[PDB]
Design a protein around this nucleic acid. Sequence first.
RNA 1: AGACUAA
Length: 451
Amino acid sequence: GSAMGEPDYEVDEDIFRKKRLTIMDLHPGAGKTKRILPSIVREALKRRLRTLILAPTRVVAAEMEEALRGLPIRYQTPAVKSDHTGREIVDLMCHATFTTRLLSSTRVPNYNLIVMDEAHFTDPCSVAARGYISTRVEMGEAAAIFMTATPPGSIDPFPQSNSPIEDIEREIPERSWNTGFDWITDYQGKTVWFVPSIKAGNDIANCLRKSGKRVIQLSRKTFDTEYPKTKLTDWDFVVTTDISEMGANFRAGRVIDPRRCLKPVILTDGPERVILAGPIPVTPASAAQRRGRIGRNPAQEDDQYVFSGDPLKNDEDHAHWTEAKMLLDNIYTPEGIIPTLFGPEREKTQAIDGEFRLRGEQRKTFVELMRRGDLPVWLSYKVASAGISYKDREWCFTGERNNQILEENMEVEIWTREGEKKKLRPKWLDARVYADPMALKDFKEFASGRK
RNA sequence: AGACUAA
Ligand SMILES: Nc1ncnc2c1ncn2[C@@H]1O[C@H](COP(=O)(O)OP(=O)(O)O)[C@@H](O)[C@H]1O
Ligand code: VO4
Ligand SMILES: [Mn+2]
């Protein structure tokens, strides 16, 4: 037993059994990361199990570190700076870090136990990592624990919370506003506002600042500096991307959730390409997770969740399902077996097994294009599978006329490393490298030979 | 778009 806050002294023997995969689907705020996880880690340490803990984002990693503080854990994330003795048997890293490791030259430790927090995360690297882990368990090589308040098949956006939540539907602004949304700024407590993009976040945060509001912006780009400010400091608004969707303990009073996102989609209407579709409704799991950032405190009884619109359950056209298979078809167990996807996530797209398997140098290029090139999975796969090497940028210029990239209505031109001026006209189109202007600048650098 | 940055 335990009291609130402290880890249970009793841990089920059942969960460490090779061949066992445990899904702990407790409601948000139940204590999965900060009470249950420490109990498992302590017990795995006593059993001398080679253990891996996986967080979706640096936010969840930072929450884990607070709960696991004092235990011999090797943190493999820039969210946590720590003395690594080298003799730790517990590793902690992000989901995508682990998939990256699985795809790279270096060998992953043969973990006896794997704990994945937020095991519903639909990031393609996360789905791929789940495929590998469930294959290790089936092979009797590991035991695994998948922790998630919203496991695959979840459709309720309003699950159980520690404290009552007032759910309110109102219109929520997507951009700056000058009038009409007084309810946003008249509110007394602390607000977490989810935004579909960093750009949209900048706009909104700007707008609240000129209303005398103390605003912390949170994203991949501002995490290191801004996250501790949400902990140790007092603030009015956190304007945040999905970096904060899971795990975060903001101690806030209100969530604002427009329930919108931009989604990458692979088109098959003609030549295959990726577009950024939307804004479209988030999935019920995301709406549930975002709402779950409040009503976490039993002593604080009038938390608010202000939302707009219904969520959308169907995400079969999202690129991540295909991209997860592209990654997984190129990961191998030490026995030589290619993993299959985690059970519940099979047949999300109708993809022939092993149809994304790349040969030799092609697999190395694929990885290079993602890790060094910063290119999406799909584009990286298209380039790699065509037999192009990482440094060969000719594909960026040899597409059909319809592939010409435009910026401010002008045909984008590239000056190459050799001083050639070429029109940017890639053989494969992925809107993720050209839609946002900063993404396009990066892709111009890539096409130039400067990455 | 968002997330990841390890060995
Ligand atoms: N640093 C902290 N100080 C005080 N209370 C906290 C802190 N972090 C989390 N809590 C509380 O402890 C409970 C468990 O949190 P957590 O383990 O993150 O839940 P879960 O991961 O299952 O959503 C939550 O209700 C939260 O309000
Ligand atoms: O189950 V949670 O750590 O996303 O509140
Ligand atoms: Mn958690």
